[PDB]
Amino acid sequence: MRIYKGVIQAIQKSDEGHPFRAYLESEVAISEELVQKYSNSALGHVNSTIKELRRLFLVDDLVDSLK
């Protein structure tokens, strides 16, 4: 569950456009490990954002993005 605590990286990173809901979209394919995938798939975060965004809203899993 730490993911939620790990997501803080988004909240604290007020230098990244302070994105919260948009960050949640990516938390889905990351859900497994926040820091590991985050540091490793530094790239995947790019398309996943474009591909998953429109998709996330259709399924509305922003709240459940955490788990």
UniProtKB/Swiss-Prot annotation:
Query: How are the domains described in the entry?
Result: Three regions, residues 59-172, 544-725 and the loop 66 amino acids, between the two transmembrane domains, known as Nogo-66 loop, appear to be responsible for the inhibitory effect on neurite outgrowth and the spreading of neurons. This Nogo-66 loop also mediates the binding of RTN4 to its receptor.
Query: What gene does this protein come from?
Result: Rtn4
**Shown portion of the whole protein?**
1025 to 1090 of 1162
Q: What happens when the gene is disrupted?
A: Isoform A mutant embryos show defects in the development of fore- and hindlimb innervation. Increased fasciculation and decreased branching of nerves innervating fore- and hindlimbs seen. Disturbances of the radial migration pattern of neuronal precursor cells seen in embryonic cortex. Isoform A mutants show increased density of blood vessels in postnatal brain, which is lost in adult brain. Knockout mice for isoforms A and B are markedly hypotensive compared to control mice, with no significant increase of heart rate. They have mesenteric arteries thinner than controls.
Q: What the protein does?
A: Required to induce the formation and stabilization of endoplasmic reticulum (ER) tubules. They regulate membrane morphogenesis in the ER by promoting tubular ER production. They influence nuclear envelope expansion, nuclear pore complex formation and proper localization of inner nuclear membrane proteins. However each isoform have specific functions mainly depending on their tissue expression specificities.
Q: Subunit details for this protein?
A: Binds to RTN4R. Interacts with ATL1. Interacts with TMEM170A. Interacts with RTN4IP1.
Organism (species): Mus musculus
Which ranges sit in the Lumenal compartment? 2-55
Tell me what this protein is called.
Reticulon-4
Residues with PTM N6-acetyllysine: K51
Induction cue: Isoform C: expression is induced by hypoxic treatments or myocardial infarction. Isoform C: is negatively regulated by the microRNA miR-182. Isoform B: expression is down-regulated by LPS in alveolar epithelium. Isoform B: induced during tissue ischemia. Isoform B2: induced during tissue ischemia.
